[PDB]
Structure formats: C-alpha cells, structure tokens
C-alpha cells in the first residue's frame, strides 16, 4: 500500500460502521493527527472539507485524493456507498507514502478498502437495522431577542412608524389592516378572524417551531460473506434514509449493492472484481447561506414576534402577513408543495484486476475500472396558485451524465541479492479520464396540473432556449519505486514519477517528481532486550509532489457567443488566458519517531513536518481595468511548519474489565512568503481578511473601543498612535485607514481529539471527543439583530432597549441612529470541544444461543451524536463557517437505536 | 496518447481575416453595450439625490444611497461570477466595455492595414464599423469620468486628486497596472474620439439599433454641457434637434401608449435591440412592481418627496406615466417610468414588466439646447424650444427664466439619474432633512435623517475607487479624505 518509511495512520472498521449520517468523513473528526475535518452545514446532502497539514494553496483545492480500492472517486460518489462494507481507512499524510498516486496527492491520500470474505466452512450472514431521530443542537441564541410588545414599543419610540404616533395607532390602524389583504382572497376571506389571526399582539408566535422540526433517520442492510480455499466473496444489499431537520425539505435516500469477488484460477493467475451500484435521491435546502425574510435561522431570529404563522389549533397555516405586502407570503410546507423537486441518480462502479506470476519474483498486475453516473432531475412551479404572481405553471427537466475510466498496469520484481539484503523494484503506468455533460429543457404556460408534459406549453414568446454544459479532462502518469532493506533494521526507499495532465498547455503539461525515505529500527539493532521498552522506530523522509486541481480550460484565450439580434450571431471575448500555466510544486520534509511501551500497552508517535508550496496556482484578482474578474497564474509561495503527536493506552483493572484511551494533537503554523503582482499584502474586499508576506491568512478590521459617554458615538482606535501617558488614542469618524491586521488566523491552528472506552461482560461504552482551538468567525447575524441605524422592521436583541440617551447616560450600547461596522466587536471566538458520539452497546451472551443453530449472535446498541458542545460562540453553531457565519443550517443532534443479528 | 482537451462552444481569439468576422465581433460589442448602458446601473446615482424617501419595505439595499451612509458607500458592490452590482459593478462594466471596444478597434485597424477585405463596399463598411467603435470608447471613458472624478467646485479632497481623471488604456492588454491620468488628457481623448468619428459616419441614420452621427452629436453636446462650455454644446445640439419629432398625444392614455412602446416612439436617437426572448429585462427597483394575474401591484422601497410631486401640474401627461399615484392602491406617488412594454410579453394578457435599453432621446437635446441658449445670452431660441417641449408634454411654461429650466429638466429626466450631476452643476445643496414627505403615505413613508451632511463641495458626490484597485496597484491616488 505504502512504504515502511512513510507516515501512515490507519482507522479501523469500528470507527466507520454505525454512523447516522451520509457524510463518512465526518466520522473522522478527531481521529487522525494532522487531518482537519470540518463540515459547515447539517444538510443531509452536505459533505465534509478535509485539510491535511494545513492549507496548501491559496487558489487551488486543498482536498486530498479520495481512493476506493484503486480507483479515485469524488466524495459525492462515496456518499452512495454503504459504510458497513468498509474494512479500514488509511490516511497517507507523507511524501514517501503518496508516491504512486499523482493527481493531487501533494494534499494527502485517503485510502478506503472494502471488505472481502474471510473463507471458512460456513459463510456468515449479518442483518443490521437501525432507527433514530435528529434535532437541532442549540436553541439558546433566541433566548435574548425581544418580545412582541417590546419590539413595537421600541419601533414606536425610535421613529420607525413616523413622528407623533401612539403604540395603539400603529397597533390598530396600521398593522391590523391585514383584513384588507386577506379579504381579497376567496380561501382567506371567510377564514380571517375565525381560525386565522395573522397579526397577534397578545401572545407571541414561536418561529422555531414554524421553521424547524424533528426528523427521522433509518437504515438497514443484509450482508453475506464466505469463500472456499481459492475464491472469496462478500455481497451486501442495503437501504439508508435521512430526513432534514428544517421545514425547507432536504433529504438523502439510497438503495445500495455491492459484490466483491476474488478468485485464484490456477498457479499463475488471480482475478477479481469489485462491483457496486446504487439508486439515490438527493434534495438540498438551497436557500441557506443567504438572507431572506422568513427563511433559515435568520428567520427564527429576526421575524417580529407579533406575526403569527399558525392556526387556532396550533398547526401551521398556508400563509402569513407582513405589513406593506401586496400578496401573502407562503410558509415552508406550502412553498414546498407548490414547487416540487425530484432527483433520481443511478450509479455504477465496476473495477477489476488480473494478476500474473509467471516466474518466482515478478508479478504483472493489470487493473481497469469505470464509474458511471446518470442523474435525472425535475422541478415544477404548479399552476392555479392563489398566492403567486401568475396562475400559470412551469416545468424544467435536466439529465446529467458522468463517465470516468481508469487503467493501471504495474510490474513488480522482488528478490534477495544475498542472505541479508532485500531489494524490490516496481514500475507502473496510469491513465485517468473523465467526460460529463448536462442537457436541459424547460417549458412555461401550463394551466392544469395533469396536462404538464414538457411538450404542452405555450408556443409563442413563452419558448426559451435549452441548457447544455460539457466538461472533460485526462491524466497520464508513469512511476517507479525501489526499496532496499538491510539485515532487518535499515530500510531505504526511492521513488521517481512523471505526471502529465490535460489542464495545462501543450508544452507545459509534464512534470517530474521524486521521493527519498528511510526507516531505522533502533530496537532490533541497538538495545535488543529491555524490561520496559518494546519497540522504537525512527523514520525520515523528503519528497516532492505536485498539485493540479484548478479547472479544465484555464490556459486558453477564448471567445463565446453573445447574440445581439435574432438574425446573425455575435462574438465576445471570454477569458484572457495564460500560455505558461504549469503544475504547482510542493516539497515536504518529515521526521518522525514511533515508540512502544509495556508489552505494547502504551504507544506513541511524534512527527515534525515542514511543507513548502512553490509556484502556487493562485486565482489572482486581476484589477477591474482589464475587464476580467480573475485569472489563474503560477505566482506565489507558502510554508506550513508543524508537529503532531499521538498516543494510545490501556488502563484496565481486572479479569473482565477492559479500559483504554487515545489522544491526538497537531499545531500548524502557516506563512505566506511571496504574493503575486510584486505586492507585500493584498486585502480581500468584503471578506474581512488579508494575505500578508510573513504571516498567515489573518483577519483585517478596525478595533472597536466602546462609546463616548458624553456624545453617544461609536469609537475606534486609531492604529499605532498613543498620546500622553493615558491610554491609546480613539476617534469617532470611521475611515478605511483604521483597519489593522489582527493576529487571529482564518484557518485554525490547533486541532485534535481524544477517546474513552470501557467494557464489561458484554456491555461496552465508548466516547469520542473532538476539539478545535484557535478559530475565529465574523458573526454576520449580529449585524442585523444589534443595530439601531437600519433594518428597523426586524426583531432586535434585548440590549437595544438600554440605549444611550441624554436621560440614560451610563450605558454601553451606542445611540440609535448609527450603522455598525464590521470591526472587532463582530469577531467571535468560535473554538469548540464536542462530544462526537456516545455509544453504549451490549453483545448478547453466548449461553442463549446454545441449542438453536439458525441464530448465532445478536447485538443491541444505543447511540447519541453531537450531544455536547463547549463554546463561547453566540450563533447557533461554531463549526458552520469559514470566516463568516451566514444564515446557517446548524449541525444535527441524533439519537439512534439499532440491532444486529449475526445469524 | 493525445491529452489535448479543448472547450465546447468556445473558439480562440484570432486576428480578423474575413468581413463576417468583423461583423460578428461588432454585434458582440453591441450586445455587450446593452448590458452596460441599461437603466439598472443608473439607479444608484438617482437615489443619491434629494428626491427620494425610503419606505418601510427597505431591506438596507437603497438606504445607503438615499440617507448617505458613507460607511457602506466606501466599499460598495460586487463584481464576480455570482453578482455584478453597486459602485464596483458600475466600475467593472464600463472598464469591460472600454477594453472590448479597444480590442475590436485595434483588430479591425490591423485588418484594414493588412488588406484582407475583398471589395470596396467591405472597406467602406469596415471604416464605418471603426467609427462606431470609436464612439463607444468615448462613451465608456466619459461615463467612468462622470462618477469617479471631481467637479472643479470641490473643497476638500485626498491630497493630489483634484485634477485627476481615471486610468486611461488606449490599447487592449489585460496585464496593465498604472497611475491615473489627468482630467485634460481624458477629455481630449474623449473629444478626439468623437470628432474623429463624426467625420466618417454618414449623414442620415442607418438603423435605430446602431451608432449614427446623430448619436455622436447628442453625446458630444451632453459632454460639452456637463463640462461647462455652452457655445459648443448649443452648436452641437442644433444639428440634431430638428430631425426627431416629439410625441403628439391628446390625453394621458395616448401618451402612455406611444411613450412606453420602443418600436413606435418617434423620438429615440439610439436604443438597444429587445425582443420578448432576447434583450429584455425588468427594472423594478424604483417602483417595486410585481404582476398579479392581469394587473400590477406595487411595493416600493423608496417614494418621491412632496416637492417632486408638486412640480407636475394636474393636467400633465407625465403625472400618470412618469410618476403614478399607485402606492397603497391610490394613496401616493411613485416613479413609474420603467414599468413595462407590452410587446415583450409571453402571453399578451398577463404582464411580466419587461423593458428594453434606450440610450438617448430627443427630449434631452431640447433641454441641452435651452440651457446653453440661456447661458450664452440667446432668449428667442430658449423660448422657441421650451414652449415646444412643454406643450408637447401637456402643460406649457409661461415664462423662461432658468427656474422653469431647472423645473422642466427635473420633471423630464426622472429615473435616468441626471439630478445629482445637475445639483452639482447648479450649486444646489442636499436639504434632505428639511423636506416633507407625502401626507397620504404616513406609516409607509417616514422621516429618516441623513447619516452624513452633504453641503456644496462635499467630496462624496463623486464615488470612491473600488477596493480591488488601491490593492492591486498602489500608485492609484484615491478620491476621498477618509
């Protein structure tokens, strides 16, 4: 798989099996040292974001290579694989281990191996089933917002409804002219006042119950595993279904299948296949991340509490009212009923290999595989809707297709040149290909919901133009790896590969990379027997790899169709191009020390790495006078220096108990060493960040001081100026020259986790914790709930009542008519410690299945995911982010109870 | 293996070798112009004047511009692959138009010099295309200089920026960073493009959808008026004022039927192609309109003040077309100029509120001619055109004394974004806090004070350079002191 002198961290099968999410990499948060998994949404179709040893490039991707059984796959394809089929997961975070993988294997390789059948006299049949519920994890930030009466009094006093206005006038003649709007609609005309109070000033509406819910989750699979003396098989069929916890519908559902087969034909041939397929339905909540009125967690925070979306029964209505509107506003279950959306995706991955040993020594292996996805999605806009802009409906149908091929042919010759000198030589070839297209058609003008085929629309100016998008790439690669081993204690590895991709120019596409690694077993040569120490290895590596993940056609200078009339066509300039685009080179030095202890009851690993990115691919911000947004270029450099250490233990007590533990840690220091246009710093506009030479990716904003107690203004520190003895100097006029680079990093430096595990006679308990330390985020929702300057129709925080006036002059929140800025008072400390899962399982004892020969085992477990969080972030979730916390879909909290019958 | 993968639906940038390649890139230049000079980009400099009051519907979109929020207006707008809007979007679209007109002009100049065209009619058409590209370079540079350079009656600036213009590129390269030109260099470049392009384009208009000599005269008169030179402005406006008749209507519905239709409006010098399927867009910011079955319902984010409504007499034809009494179903007025055009409709019965881009109309040539004739000391011409324009619009002016001129120019160009430039050119301060709102709309339109006072000579009448510049080249001098 990898080299002996490599830094490889293996994750077993008990960390992947019983997980209630479709995000498999979310199960690895706080499990590998140096690998930082962050998932920034609780959507059932969202996917994780992995960074091994810090971020590596400013413009290209930093994601690892994801490899299932030899073929490299995307993470949405691995989303459609049953994780009860996975045997192990090994993360090759080194330069001497990722030497035979070459697309973007500078970022690390995550290798997933599927189960094969352990052969015996009787095969094994297991049947897993599971059910659970999912909730929202933090309902604390809406315990500080105003009520209805306080909000109307605050709005009346703040002049929002006009000068000389009593709370009773705004309450009666202004807002309760919701009778005029509801009286124009036949379905709400005779329902207003009886069972429909859209404006309610006595009680307060619950918007968390209107916008979020408790969702179900279920899964189940049957799996057979067997094998004879030559062959072996593992088959599995399954089912997974997860509903989203918001009222805006999002779901993931899949029916999977897998057959792994492996056969020894005769004394020189061995063949095998890993066939897989699925039928999956996805749907994502595709309004989160932006600010609308009654949408998302922004809607549970900022909707005025005197607006009722319910009935008198307590059930959710079809519409609600907001003052000034010209039509009613649909709720979420009704907007999801008049805009349907179905997706159906068929997936098939077929791999296969043939392995030939003609003579003793060499082993010619050939491997080939194809991944095929055919997606077909449809959406509607249903006709005859009273609360719409038009009574006519629309329908749009799209058909996606992806096909990826790969071939890998190696030939390895392994021999022994003497008694105590081992050598191994490997050479190989690899060809990866991809092509994909989207075709799409639309139709508008339907009048009945049964006559809604796409060929039955209006046929005049209601016709439109189809959609079509094609993409493709290819990689060609050759490699060779040599190993040498001395007597048993000294190992050297050498490696040379050549990589070409289709994403670069015709005379810039090929590159040469190399790697040198070495391991020294100090225990088996120097101190061959000891009472407490049990193993001691020292490994050291230097390598060079490349990164090429930027996008397909980015070096050409192009021209597209921009039609003017309907007679002749027109041509506009698309891109600028870059004729000398090439690879991004990354060199990594690694030095590690692995040690064991008291008959391997304690073990530890310490690794130090330096990682250097030269000629990095930056999507550089071309200035606006060129007429292009950006351009991919080979300019800049970066460096990541760090240490990561791991340790496993066993602390157990008696004959029956078995108590163990583990821990991880990783500190990582980034540094930008060269930017693009001869610049020393570049401030990214409207992000709040900066790239400056010598420092990591930091934050960049003014420092909020407080308020002036005599005038009520907001005050900021003028940077780099101190007056007489006193304090620093402040100012009350906001300028852009007040912005200082803060010593607070965008990507979090400290990352880790730990674990506890205890057991007894059958009963077992497991607990995994994962922490991120050093994270900061700009809370964007506190721009909307904490200002008196603008957006006065929204619900505000309770502190704005105690505002500065000439009467009330010993406060600390500012005067009313002032807009807030994106300064240091919006940077929140988003570091967290999370209890990832808490599992309590009970293997049923072997005494019950004594005489019955059809059932051979049973196992029952309870499980709770995401049930503890230790934060200072006041924003529904610290993990959902990446420098700005927008209207976010928070992480779920699951309670799952399943069974397994091994009969 | 060949690993050459080339895009679909995309070709390579090559020098022009045919006549149909020149025609194709010219049609691409005009379709790029249609998405630059459309009324959606001139709403920001219209709301920033002293005529608008934000309602309670506003979600902080128009409220920086109306209430003068200089903490947002410094770094405002986006220009990326998601959205193009704001001050940064206004900067980006005119720099893109300037660069693409440069590429077209230099490529057709080199094709003319290499003798790749067959006949003599192809040479004549290629020279006409070259002049039509020179006009568009002039328009792009002038509209950037309009917003991002100081008028000469300014008091406090960033030190060194009172006699600066914008960054002037005269040939296509996207890899250029440099310092700002002066105002004299940019104005001689603009006027050289226009005077070189008038001498080539023919005397009569070929089509209403392409650049003519009438549009070059109209643009040169507009630039000369906004410069401060009234003799050349009157001399240029006199050559185009008598070729385009006004709308002859008898009541407000006939004026609405002839004004709103682009195909039958007899006083358009230049406009962009629009169909129901290609070239139409909705501009529903100033009126907030939304279709509902067969009628329209309005929810405006900003409504005009009472002194704006009181400019129009009750028998004016523009008091039911340009502003309409449709707020809260009958209670107040909004600016309803860019409502709709009934030709660009999916179904003829149901509105979709789609309009097209118009670049110049003759009712601004009249106002340029009256203002220049009044300032150069010529009284019969100013009456001869102000009585004609105001009588064709419905209610005639009695006396012509440059108060009637200010009132008529404010009445005629509403929504087009010419009031901020006028109140800079006329030394008019803001006085947004002193104005009263419409009395029928209380509860909906209320009193918000300015977040920054704007006297005569304030720096914030001209916009600040977007913050991708001032970051990618540090030899760019910014505008504002803060």
């Amino acid at each position: 798989l990898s080299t002996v002198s490599g830094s490889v961290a293996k994750v077993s099968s008990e960390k992947l099996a019983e997980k209630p999410v479709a995000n498999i990499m979310d199960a690895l948060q706080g499990q590998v040292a140096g690998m930082q998994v962050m998932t920034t949404s609780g959507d059932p179709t969202a996917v994780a974001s992995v960074e091994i040893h810090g971020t590596g490039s400013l413009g290209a991707s930093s994601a690892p290579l994801y490899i299932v059984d030899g073929m490299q796959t995307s993470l949405d394809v691995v989303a459609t694989m049953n994780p009860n089929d996975f045997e192990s997961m090994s993360v090759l975070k080194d330069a001497s281990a990722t030497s035979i993988y070459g697309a973007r294997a500078a970022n690390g390789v995550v290798f997933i191996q599927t189960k094969k059948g352990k052969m015996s006299e009787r095969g094994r049949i297991t049947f897993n089933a599971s059910y659970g519920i999912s909730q929202i994890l933090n309902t604390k930030p809406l315990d500080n917002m105003m009520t209805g009466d306080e909000l109307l009094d605050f709005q009346v006093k703040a002049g929002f409804w006009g000068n000389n206005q009593t709370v009773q006038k705004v309450k009666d003649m202004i807002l309760a002219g919701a009778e005029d709007l509801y009286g124009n609609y036949d379905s709400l005309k005779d329902e207003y006042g009886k069972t429909l109070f859209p404006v309610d000033f006595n009680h307060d509406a619950d918007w968390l119950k209107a916008l979020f819910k408790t969702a179900p989750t279920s899964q189940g699979d049957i799996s057979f595993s067997g094998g004879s003396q030559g062959t072996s098989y593992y088959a599995s069929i399954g089912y997974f279904d997860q509903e989203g916890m918001a009222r805006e519908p999002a779901n993931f559902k899949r029916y999977s299948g897998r057959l792994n087969f492996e056969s020894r034909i005769n004394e020189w041939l061995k063949v095998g296949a890993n066939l897989s397929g699925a039928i999956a339905n996805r749907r994502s909540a595709d309004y989160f991340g932006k600010y609308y009125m009654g949408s998302g967690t922004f809607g549970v925070l900022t909707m005025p509490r005197y607006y009722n979306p319910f009935d008198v029964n307590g059930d959710l209505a079809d519409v609600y009212y907001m003052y000034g509107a010209t039509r009613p506003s649909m709720t979420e279950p009704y907007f999801a009923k008049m805009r349907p959306f179905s997706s159906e995706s068929h997936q098939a991955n077929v791999n296969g290999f043939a392995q030939i040993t003609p003579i003793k020594g060499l082993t010619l292996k050939a491997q080939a595989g194809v991944d095929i996805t055919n997606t077909r999605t449809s959406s509607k806009r249903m006709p005859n809707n009273p609360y719409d802009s038009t009574p006519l409906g629309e329908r749009r149908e799209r058909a996606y297709r992806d096909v990826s091929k790969s071939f890998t042919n190696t030939a390895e010759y392994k021999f022994s040149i003497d008694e105590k000198h081992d050598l191994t030589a490997l050479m190989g070839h690899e060809y990866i290909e991809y092509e994909g297209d989207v075709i799409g058609a639309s139709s508008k003008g339907f009048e009945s919901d049964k006559l809604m085929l796409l060929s039955q629309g209006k046929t005049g100016n209601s016709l439109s133009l189809p959609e079509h998008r094609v993409a493709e790439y290819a990689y060609l690669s050759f490699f060779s790896r040599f190993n040498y081993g001395f007597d048993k204690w000294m190992y050297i590895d050498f490696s040379v590969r050549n990589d070409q991709s289709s994403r670069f120019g015709s005379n810039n596409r090929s590159a040469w990379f190399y790697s040198v690694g070495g391991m020294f077993d100090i225990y088996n040569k120097f101190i061959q027997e000891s009472n407490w120490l049990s193993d001691l290895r020292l490994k050291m590596s230097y390598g060079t790899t490349g990164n090429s993940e930027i996008g397909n056609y980015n070096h050409q200078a192009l021209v597209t169709v921009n039609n003017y009339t309907e007679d002749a066509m027109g041509l506009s300039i698309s891109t600028a191009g870059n004729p000398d685009l090439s690879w991004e080179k990354q060199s990594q030095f690694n030095f590690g020390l692995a040690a064991g202890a008291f008959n391997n009851r304690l073990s530890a690993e310490v690794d130090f790495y330096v990682r250097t990115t030269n000629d990095m691919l930056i999507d550089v911000p071309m200035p606006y006078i060129s007429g292009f947004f950006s351009q991919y270029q080979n300019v800049g450099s970066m460096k990541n220096t760090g240490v990561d250490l791991s340790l496993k233990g066993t602390i157990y007590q008696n004959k029956d108990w078995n108590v163990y533990a583990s821990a991880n840690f990783n500190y990582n220091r980034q540094e930008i060493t060269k930017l693009f246009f001869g610049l020393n710093k570049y401030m990214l506009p409207n992000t709040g960040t900066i790239w400056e030479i010598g420092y990591p990716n930091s934050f960049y904003m003014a420092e909020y001081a407080g308020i002036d107690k005599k005038t009520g203004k907001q005050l900021w520190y003028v940077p780099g100026q101190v007056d007489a003895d006193g304090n620093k100097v402040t100012t009350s006029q906001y300028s852009a020259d007040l912005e200082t680079r803060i010593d607070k990093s965008v990507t979090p430096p400290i990352t880790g986790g730990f674990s506890l595990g205890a057991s007894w006679k059958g009963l077992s308990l497991d607990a995994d914790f994962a922490y991120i330390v050093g994270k900061w985020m700009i809370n964007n929702d506190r721009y909307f709930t904490e200002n008196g300057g603008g957006l006065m129709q929204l619900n505000k925080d309770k502190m704005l009542l105690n505002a500065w006036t000439e009467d009330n002059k010993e406060t600390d929140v500012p005067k009313l008519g002032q807009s807030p800025q994106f300064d240091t008072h919006l940077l929140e400390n988003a570091s967290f410690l999370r209890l990832k899962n808490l599992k309590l399982t009970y293997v049923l004892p072997n005494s019950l299945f004594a005489g019955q020969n059809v059932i051979g085992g049973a196992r029952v477990y309870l499980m709770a995911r995401n049930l503890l969080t230790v934060t200072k972030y006041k924003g529904f979730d610290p993990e959902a982010g990446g420098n700005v916390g927008k209207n976010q879909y928070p992480n779920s909290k699951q309670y799952v109870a399943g069974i397994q019958l091994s009969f | 293996c060949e690993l050459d993968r080339d895009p679909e639906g995309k070709d390579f940038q090559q020098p022009y070798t045919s006549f149909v390649q020149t025609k194709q890139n010219r049609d691409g230049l005009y379709a790029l112009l249609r998405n630059t000079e459309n009324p959606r980009m001139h709403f920001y400099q219209e709301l920033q004047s002293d005529m608008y009051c934000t309602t309670i519907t506003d979600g902080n979109s128009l409220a920086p511009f109306v209430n003068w929020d200089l903490g947002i207006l410094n770094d405002h707008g986006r220009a990326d692959e998601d959205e193009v809007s704001g001050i940064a979007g206004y900067y980006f679209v005119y720099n893109r138009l300037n660069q693409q007109a440069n590429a077209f002009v230099n490529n057709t100049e080199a094709a003319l010099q290499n003798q790749v065209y067959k006949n003599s009619t192809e040479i004549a058409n290629a020279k006409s295309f070259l002049a039509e590209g020179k006009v568009l370079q002039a328009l792009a540079i002038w509209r950037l200089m309009d917003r991002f350079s100081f008028h000469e009656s300014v008091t406090e600036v960033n030190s060194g920026a009172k006699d600066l213009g914008v960054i002037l590129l005269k040939e296509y390269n996207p890899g250029y960073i440099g310092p700002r030109a002066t105002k004299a260099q940019c104005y001689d470049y603009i006027l050289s493009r226009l005077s070189e392009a008038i001498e080539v384009l023919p005397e009569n208009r070929e089509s209403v959808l392409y650049v003519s000599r009438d549009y070059a005269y109209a643009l040169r008169a507009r630039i000369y008026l906004a410069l401060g030179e009234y003799g050349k402005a009157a001399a240029d406006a006199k050559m185009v004022v008598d070729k385009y008749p006004l709308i002859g209507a008898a009541d407000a519905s006939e004026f609405e039927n002839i004004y709103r239709s682009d195909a039958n409006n007899p006083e358009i010098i230049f406009r962009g192609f629009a169909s129901a399927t290609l070239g139409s867009f909705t501009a529903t910011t100033l009126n907030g309109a939304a279709p509902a079955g067969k009628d329209i319902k309005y929810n405006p984010s900003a409504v005009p003040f009472q002194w704006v409504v009181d400019l129009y007499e009750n028998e004016d034809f523009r008091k039911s077309v340009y502003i309409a009494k449709v707020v809260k179903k009958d209670k107040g007025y909004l600016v309803n100029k860019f409502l709709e055009d009934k030709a660009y409709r999916d179904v003829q019965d149901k509105p979709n509120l789609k309009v097209g881009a118009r670049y110049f109309s003759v009712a601004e040539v009249y106002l340029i001619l009256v203002e220049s004739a009044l300032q150069t000391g010529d009284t019969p011409t100013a009456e001869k055109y102000l009585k004609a324009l105001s009588k064709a619009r419905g209610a005639e002016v009695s006396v012509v004394n440059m108060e009637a001129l200010q009132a008529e120019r404010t009445r005629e160009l509403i929504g087009e974004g010419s009031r901020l430039r006028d109140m800079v050119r006329w030394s008019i301060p803001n006085n947004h806090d002193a104005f009263e709102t419409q009395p029928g709309l209380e509860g909906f339109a209320n009193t918000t004070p300015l977040k920054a006072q704007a006297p005569v000579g304030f720096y914030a009448y001209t916009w600040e350079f977007p913050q991708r510049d001032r970051q990618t080249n540090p030899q760019l001098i910014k505008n504002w002191p803060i």
């Binding site: 907007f335 992000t687 | 979600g59």
Partner: peptide, 13 residues
C-alpha cells in the same frame, strides 16, 4: 423567497 436584506460580507475561506 421574499425580499433580500443587504450588507453581507462575502465569504472566502
């Protein structure tokens, strides 16, 4: 759906 409330910071990283 609904009206969009402005003044967001554009997310990068």
């Amino acid at each position: 759906s609904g009206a969009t409330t402005a003044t967001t910071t554009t997310s990068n990283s």
